[PDB]
RNA sequence: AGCGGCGAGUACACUGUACUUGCUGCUUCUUAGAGGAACAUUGUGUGUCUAACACAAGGAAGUUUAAGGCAACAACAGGUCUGUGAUGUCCUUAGAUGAACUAGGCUGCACGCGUGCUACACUGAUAUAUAUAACGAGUAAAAUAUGCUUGCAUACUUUUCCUCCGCCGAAAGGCGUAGGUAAUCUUUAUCAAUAUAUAUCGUGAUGGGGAUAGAUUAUUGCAAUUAUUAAUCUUGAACGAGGAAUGCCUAGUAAGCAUGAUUCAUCAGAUUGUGCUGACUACGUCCCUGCCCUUUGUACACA
């Protein structure tokens, strides 16, 4: 009944790790035509996942120096991303983006001992990865969000070495093995 | 033709002048009312324009200025404020007091609520200074008017 | 006949006059489409779909806007129109559908009927930020 | 087409005519824009197709703009107080005019001239 | 790289110098493995592991 | 002597007799130094 | 993209029922075709506002001004050149000093007001001191709005 | 007839007296008028000497003004105000006819 | 450095990368082929 | 001040619409005069089943609902006698350490150290249009004429705030006026920006960046010179995100964006308040540092 951007009802969702869907909290109660819902998000810890994934992407994308807080140029950036990703892949881009986020690549971390990550912190870290990838992709080089996807996020989806998540995973695993 | 806010500012400064004049002249008696002796006060005011904490503090300031023993003076005024009816009184005297080393003595008796807006409402303040041989002496008089009723008090028959 | 309701979130305030007519819902003079940002036009359009065009075809709603942020004003408008439709359902048109309308409203969202209390807290002393401090040296 | 040498460096071919004529002189781009408009050069076209006739037009425009309709307030070097009147005098001999003013300041030897000689700020940089 | 299955059964407790570390037992073959996790976790969860025989410390 | 009605020398404080740090808000023409203690007698309560 | 579905009943009885930007461009083109007012010549060497500090780089800015002044005159029954300056305020980046607001030039709006007075679109009376559209100007904008409305309708 | 003061209880009691007198006299009296309250804010800083952590205080004074209208002789209402008024409250008199 | 020119999916960035030209002249080429950022047609 | 009605409709819908001019059904809506509402409230659980906290729900209010203010006991030999005709003691007083007047300095710079502003760009630089607030704060002087010879003496309103208007000049600002000692007039049926969309460019120290100086017009000031402020043009520095090091940060809060008040004849790049864009996360600890308590050892007690 309620769709997204007047185009996507997203009636098909992959099972994934059967926890990421709950974390993104996609439901008719959270079905909103356009992103950036200004609802309360910091009442408890459980409601951290209650914020929809679509809202969270645009709530995190706005972080780069001067443009902290704008979020509207960020919405344009991710919208053009959506458009070009649908251009180069003839399928529902929502599931493609969800799959790319799932297979981001840095599932393992090492700080001191290597420890696991809860699904909520996992999706938080994944959105952080897409944020930093977008930043390092849009920094200069005479290239735009089209390039940002076409050589950061498709790389993060298909496990290409050009992606920042994959190279940082390589160094993290190497140093983890070097320690133990 | 004066604006209301500036008019109230003028009223405030005039009443500040009035209160400092009351402090300057009212010396021989306590609070006996205000006018909105007496003849000369009214004449001077017109020419220029065109129990009690203050009384107890003034009495003790006279006692210490006369040179009588500070301990006896404060004990007597403390007896006086108890007999007037306050649950307690706090007197602070700061200055030379026989030594070049500045010192102060505190006198504890009564409830002595010391913070909070209910405390500010139910407790008033008196503070003065007096001249002596080698400087000034500052006196703080704190009396708490017997408590509407104090919120901290709880009692049911 | 005619009812009046109010909606307040943030600084912005909004009124809603619900009257009978032919479907003349005017945001003062400018229509509910010429606001410009389609992103907030979607939130403007959201309440209409969950109710139905036919119900609003019989009502004329006068919308008055008076200052405020872009998001605050649209949220206050949504509050005002929600209160107005609830009041007019309870008053004139139909009560039985009002129960289902409020049920589906509270099912979908909570801020549609009653807004938030979040507001600019008076910045304290210590820094340019509301909860920040000036950089200190040694 | 590209890289057209003139009195000053005018390698501006791919970039637009307005910036092209700012680069040579009048880099503040307001005088450059108004003189381009007076010469009636469409800025939509780029600077890779500049013609010698348009170059002649722009130099003739800048030659004594007082006879033209550019107002004296927009026209730089309004007075330069003396027995006569001057104008904006573009580039090399404009720098000559500026250094002539500097030497006249030196020989006048006032406080600002002394500060210029010492290499200090005029108002005061507050280096305390 | 490569990740392998682990089952989170019981939240034994919280540890660490900052309170963001929850003690957990994993599921290898080898049913015992003293691991730690960040964030809120439930009973009967599915996680991934780095290495077979890297043993942690109990606090 | 050239008494002028403008600037620093135009006015002086009523109580402290020093025109330095005079606040002219509401034309009170009182020094802030004395205002610190005159705030209660002036009737202008400090709440928050 | 520019056309959006409308669920409520419209009136299309004035300029308030249409987009401001598109109508402003359409009326600027109409005035360009009509040659009702001059460029004017004296305004070619002057930027739009002090804060703008450079050329508008659009070669239609005066006609956009002319198509917006009467739009805002209809929106607010009584306003003036000061209100127009406040509405079209921009930024004055004073170099190192932090950015601030700045009103646009007032003489160009005064000249536009003179041109509209000569055209008869606006009248001045002691009562309702702010500028208001005359009756014939209101009918003219009503006809133009109802005409562009049907054009963008079908 | 309008009144102005600082303390709210005084204006409340005299307004109650005003409505009681209006009801007793049975005049063409307008409804109570409740103007928005005005807060007068000033800033100050403690520590008369510059030493120490400079801290500031905010002092607010709250005005209180209300209005009413009556259709009666001015002398009786002004005598009533005089006998039932506080010297700390200021009142202006404006009459109405119909 | 910039070394693109003007002499010889219609999205601006993609066609600019394909033809090795500036995006302004790429927009000009887009309009020429058809006959500030907007959604895909 | 708002919700309404009708006397006339400006053009259209069709069997009111945006907008005016005049009176008054009413006061949830603009606002406060008081009161209540919120108390781990209820239940599923943790607890020596006592003191407690968690989950879910009604609910605007479930870390006291959050920001504020009062800050004990006592101390620093912490800051101020440059805030006072509050203040002891010592010192000056006619060639004054009293007061008044001219000019200069606190603004000068081989340099070093703190708080800040603008930037190092394409989520960017530039122009054009839409949607936009609150706290605000606001009335012993001009000119004229007479006599003497432009200045002095003499008399008439108040010129001594923000200001809408109609013009003069891009502008600064000025001219004669509406309003207001003030929810009425500035102004607030509205004062900003980050946005929004289209257009010039298109990441090349460039058109970014605006240090620097030159040419100037106007106001503030009897005085702008050490160019107060300022509309314009020209001038075009470093700067490719910053080593050892360091500060602030838990939700309308970080961060970014603006705006009112303070001192003001004039001048915020300072401080305070107001509003907008509403983020990345923790939801706990003593590893660093700073305090608290207990035990212990002291040859320290100005510790």
Short mmCIF file of C-alpha atoms in Angstrom, two decimals, chain G residues 64-118:
data_model
loop_
_atom_site.label_atom_id
_atom_site.label_comp_id
_atom_site.label_asym_id
_atom_site.label_seq_id
_atom_site.Cartn_x
_atom_site.Cartn_y
_atom_site.Cartn_z
CA UNK G 64 13.36 38.35 -14.38
CA UNK G 65 13.30 41.23 -11.88
CA UNK G 66 10.34 42.71 -13.76
CA UNK G 67 8.52 39.37 -13.79
CA UNK G 68 9.16 38.87 -10.06
CA UNK G 69 8.31 42.35 -8.76
CA UNK G 70 4.66 42.13 -9.82
CA UNK G 71 4.53 38.52 -8.60
CA UNK G 72 5.56 39.61 -5.10
CA UNK G 73 3.31 42.67 -5.44
CA UNK G 74 0.37 40.32 -5.90
CA UNK G 75 1.55 38.05 -3.08
CA UNK G 76 1.77 40.96 -0.63
CA UNK G 77 -0.93 43.61 -1.19
CA UNK G 78 1.23 46.52 0.07
CA UNK G 79 5.04 46.41 -0.01
CA UNK G 80 7.93 48.52 -1.25
CA UNK G 81 11.47 48.66 -2.61
CA UNK G 82 12.82 47.98 0.87
CA UNK G 83 10.76 44.79 1.04
CA UNK G 84 11.99 43.81 -2.43
CA UNK G 85 15.59 44.34 -1.29
CA UNK G 86 14.98 42.26 1.85
CA UNK G 87 13.41 39.48 -0.23
CA UNK G 88 16.27 39.46 -2.76
CA UNK G 89 18.97 39.81 -0.08
CA UNK G 90 22.18 37.89 -0.78
CA UNK G 91 25.57 37.31 0.83
CA UNK G 92 28.38 39.85 1.23
CA UNK G 93 31.52 37.77 1.85
CA UNK G 94 33.77 40.49 3.28
CA UNK G 95 36.89 38.47 2.57
CA UNK G 96 38.34 37.10 5.79
CA UNK G 97 35.44 38.56 7.78
CA UNK G 98 32.55 36.10 8.17
CA UNK G 99 29.70 36.14 5.69
CA UNK G 100 26.63 38.31 6.27
CA UNK G 101 23.38 39.28 4.59
CA UNK G 102 23.04 42.30 2.32
CA UNK G 103 20.08 43.90 0.57
CA UNK G 104 20.02 44.31 -3.19
CA UNK G 105 20.31 47.63 -4.99
CA UNK G 106 17.27 49.84 -4.56
CA UNK G 107 17.56 52.13 -7.58
CA UNK G 108 17.01 49.32 -10.08
CA UNK G 109 13.79 48.36 -8.30
CA UNK G 110 12.84 52.05 -8.23
CA UNK G 111 13.38 52.17 -12.01
CA UNK G 112 11.28 49.03 -12.46
CA UNK G 113 8.55 50.69 -10.40
CA UNK G 114 8.76 53.77 -12.64
CA UNK G 115 8.46 51.56 -15.73
CA UNK G 116 5.42 49.75 -14.31
CA UNK G 117 3.82 53.07 -13.33
CA UNK G 118 4.31 54.31 -16.89
#
